[PDB]
Amino acid sequence: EVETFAFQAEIAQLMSLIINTFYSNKEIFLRELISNSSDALDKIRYESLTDPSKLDSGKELHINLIPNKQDRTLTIVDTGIGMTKADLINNLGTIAKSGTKAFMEALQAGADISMIGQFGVGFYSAYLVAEKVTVITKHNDDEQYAWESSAGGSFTVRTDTGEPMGRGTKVILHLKEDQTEYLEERRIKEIVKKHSQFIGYPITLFVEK
């Protein structure tokens, strides 16, 4: 049972700007997704300070980067707080309507796309490099769900029958054909060292056969 939703007009406009604007510094997508993962890990850590049972779904707090050249996917996995179904539908837990408004005002006022994270909508920078994004998520208070969008104004949400996650979020980037440099170990390592050197959780870059 797959449910199809329309993006709010302002979010569709944000994604079309990300997809259509000429902007060479695409590597910032990874910084933005890792920062989102760190924010999600912060949230479940804070909740666990007064309720240790919040970690019954997994004690380890970490971020994994999993490139797969055969599938042409880059997956960012975190064991953070995850999102409920309501969170997924409500722009993946963001205030994306007001954030887009502030972002697009900054763009005509000098800013560039690399500052997207300052407006709370850094997730959508995934579409700098991905033709399709799949988000698998599990929150302690809900079931496991899969969100998916190839932009074009709509997204889908369905119950996920795949590998149980325990708790957290998995962002699967189905990369554009000319963006496969972000599957290379040395390229990912360079970006993490440049932009994510002070993230307070272990970031493990998986290798391939």
Ligand SMILES: Oc1ccc(Oc2ccccc2)cc1
């Ligand atoms: O890109 C991401 C990464 C992790 C996400 O999960 C979160 C869940 C709750 C708060 C923040 C984040 C949401 C988007």
